[PDB]
């Protein structure tokens, strides 16, 4: 009785939200950006190849200096690379080799990683002993750790396969806020440029916008047909792009609270593993299961170019803060740095 | 054309590669085994004989084994099952005494049939096309006792064989091995274990050695 009545009210609320979004869908992003000229053909060459990982690379993250990056592989090794010289700065042996994510702190003093061990380990890079040591192991998640992002040296947000995201206090080792509401495994998260909000994508084909301080879900974004594997905020923080297993990328707007554009091709039938934006946001780079990385025109939904330099899945990619280069990691155990030429 | 500290930084990187090469050589000589099965199917007993992922290390006749137990994860299997692509073999545990039992959660699904669907998905999985399977059939002593009271007809309606233990045990083994839709790329090693058995580790060593040798014969191009 009460349960049946309540679930009918939920449908009414869903219809109210759908009508509200349809009311403000006066135009399409494609129509608005039809007049502007295309970006042309985007040609990028492999400037560097980072060798030394002996297994599938699952994650990478640039440092804020746009020169150092950390990559994670399931050979149980965290490696910090000098991208300019390809020198290895550090090699961190992991206690658990089943790592799935890695993050570089914006200060550069810490790195984080975690996987099937359900633990987010924090590593101190600046020690008087001259070696990298574990500073914290964040326990509390009941599923595998899929993504992690630092807010500062003391706060980090982690998403797990137990359908929840958490905000952690590194000094005390306790999760100050828990973000619940996803009905599937949360696979990725992206921080807003002001680090006051973050979006997360789960296997329920939905993306939720979370308030860090308040600790509740502000908005929910649907439209994908399969699990969301990747998510990335637009550089101005008013939009984000997702990547799913249905071979599509979608651009959602926070203020319009709906999808604006779909990035799919008939030839593409494989899942998407990673997505990122260029510095101006005009280019959307997505990694695919078909061993390639496709560069999309964000405004016009045109495939600007293809990065084909890997012999296995492109599992991760990232663009530097200055926008100078893009790094792609892959299951073939190599990292490559790409940029164009005049 | 490098500075004094640049030439020293390159030397540091060269030493890192030397340690990475040595760790890769050491890791390539270790046998990695993915342990699977259903809950309360003898899997825990196997580990003794030998909140995320539980890893067990043991050595048998100058061979180091790594056993990965992933039964404590309730998340989506397809989001992390590709992480084990490349293990030497899969150790699958099936409880023979659970042929007439009913799954506790579903309350209407046969327990033995729940193992077949788990075995069928793992054996035919795209990530384990070339990975052999070591099938352990536990609780053989308790299976014989339940045979006298509860016949095998409950589990398999189309079972016209005799009610003897040897006929019943062999029929179950054939059904599991018939779920292998790729009988050329991979091989299934079946062993009947028990609580008091002590040769289970030996069978793993024999099966792992058979897999390792047949991997070399493919690398050499003679097979």
């Amino acid at each position, epitope marked *: 009785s009460e349960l049946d009545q309540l679930r009918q009210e939920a449908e009414q609320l869903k219809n109210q939200i759908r009508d509200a979004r349809k009311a403000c869908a006066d135009a399409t992003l494609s129509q608005i950006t039809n007049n502007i000229d295309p970006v042309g053909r985007i040609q990028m060459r492999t400037r560097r190849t980072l060798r030394g990982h002996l297994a599938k690379i699952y994650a990478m993250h640039w440092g804020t200096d746009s*020169r*150092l990056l950390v990559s994670a592989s399931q050979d149980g090794k965290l490696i910090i690379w*000098d991208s300019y*010289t390809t*020198n290895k*700065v*550090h090699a961190i042996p992991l206690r658990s080799s089943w790592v799935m994510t890695c993050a570089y702190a914006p200060s*550069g003093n810490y790195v984080a990683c975690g996987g099937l061990d359900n633990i987010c380990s924090i590593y101190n890079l*600046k020690t*008087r*002993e*001259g*070696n990298v040591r574990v500073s914290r192991e964040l326990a509390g998640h009941t599923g595998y750790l899929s993504c992690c992002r630092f807010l500062d040296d003391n706060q980090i947000v982690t998403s797990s396969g137990d359908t929840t995201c958490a905000l952690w206090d590194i000094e005390t080792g306790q999760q100050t806020t828990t973000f619940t509401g996803h009905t599937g495994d949360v696979m990725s998260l992206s921080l807003a440029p002001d680090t006051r909000l973050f979006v997360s994508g789960a296997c329920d084909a939905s993306a939720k916008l979370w308030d860090v301080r308040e600790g509740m879900c502000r908005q929910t974004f649907t439209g994908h047909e399969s699990d969301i594997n990747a998510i990335c905020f637009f550089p101005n923080g008013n939009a984000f792009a997702t990547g799913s297993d249905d071979a599509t990328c979608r651009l959602f707007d926070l203020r319009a609270d709906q999808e604006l554009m779909t990035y799919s091709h008939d030839n593409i039938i494989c899942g998407i593993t990673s997505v990122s934006f260029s510095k101006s946001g005009r280019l959307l780079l997505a990694g695919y299961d078909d061993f390639n990385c496709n560069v999309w025109d964000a405004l016009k939904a045109d495939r600007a170019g293809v990065l084909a330099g890997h012999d296995n899945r492109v599992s991760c990619l990232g663009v530097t803060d200055d926008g100078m280069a893009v790094a792609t990691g892959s299951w073939d155990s190599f990292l490559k740095i790409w940029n164009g030429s005049s | 054309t490098l*500075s*004094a*500290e*640049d*030439k*020293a*930084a390159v*030397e*540091r990187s*060269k*030493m890192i590669d030397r340690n990475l090469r040595e760790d890769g050589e050491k890791a390539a000589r270790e046998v990695k085994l993915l342990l699977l099965g259903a809950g309360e199917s003898g899997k825990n007993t196997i580990v003794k004989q030998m909140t995320g992922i539980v890893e067990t290390h043991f050595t048998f006749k100058d061979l180091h084994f790594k056993m990965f137990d992933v039964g404590a994860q309730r998340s989506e299997r397809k989001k992390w099952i590709h992480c084990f692509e490349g293990v030497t073999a899969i150790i699958f545990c099936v409880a023979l005494s659970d042929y007439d039992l009913v799954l506790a959660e579903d309350e209407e699904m046969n327990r033995m049939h729940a193992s077949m669907k788990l075995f069928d998905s793992i054996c035919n999985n795209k990530w384990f096309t070339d990975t052999s399977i070591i099938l352990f059939l536990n609780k053989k002593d308790l299976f014989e006792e339940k045979i006298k009271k509860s016949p095998l007809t409950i589990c398999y309606p189309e079972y016209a064989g005799s009610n003897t233990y040897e006929e019943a045990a062999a029929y179950i083994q054939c059904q599991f091995e018939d779920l292998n839709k790729r009988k050329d790329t991979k091989e299934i090693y079946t062993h009947f274990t028990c609580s008091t058995d002590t040769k289970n580790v030996q069978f793993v060593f024999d099966a792992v050695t058979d897999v390792i040798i047949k991997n070399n014969l493919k690398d050499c191009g003679l097979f």
Partner: single-chain antibody
Amino acid sequence: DVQLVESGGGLVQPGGSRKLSCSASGFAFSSFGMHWVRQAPEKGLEWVAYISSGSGTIYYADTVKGRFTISRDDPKNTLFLQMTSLRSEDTAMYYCVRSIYYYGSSPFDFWGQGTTLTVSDIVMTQATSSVPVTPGESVSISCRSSKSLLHSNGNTYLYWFLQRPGQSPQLLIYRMSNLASGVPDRFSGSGSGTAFTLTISRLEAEDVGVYYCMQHLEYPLTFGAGTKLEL
């Protein structure tokens, strides 16, 4: 804590041999390159030898090459300096210095207490030998090099050290601008090309001492004469 204890020094006859030891504790010794730096009585610092991490690279000063042998024992965390044909010119306090080299590292960050031995090229110039100072007042120290220390990679390999009376040298500024860990922010290093300045705002009693500028652009590493601050 990080410690570097030297031993083996003492009074030796000319032409003799002596073995210096440097025991390291509290840090990953095998990850750090090691230097020997000596200081003659009432004189400045002089670089002696260098052995890299992993013992793959070894350098010697011209004044000691062929007579001194530097070696390390990584399992025992001990650094050695085998000396032969000792001359009266070798009478100095020998310091054990650790230095690690990677992107963003701070070489020469920790110095040992030193051991005393008594026997019976880019030019770095510090023209101002002494500077009378008062607490709370800003002081500038100048250093010059015969060659440009700015490399094509953007780094300027200039280092600043402070040797308080009775104490071992301490790193203040590495690569001409970066401030060493544990050093107050009042110290600042500024330079360009061949001319460099160390500015000390709001001088305090602890800042009193001798300041040395060292170049790390290429071997042999050379030190300036040193500028002494006195009240």
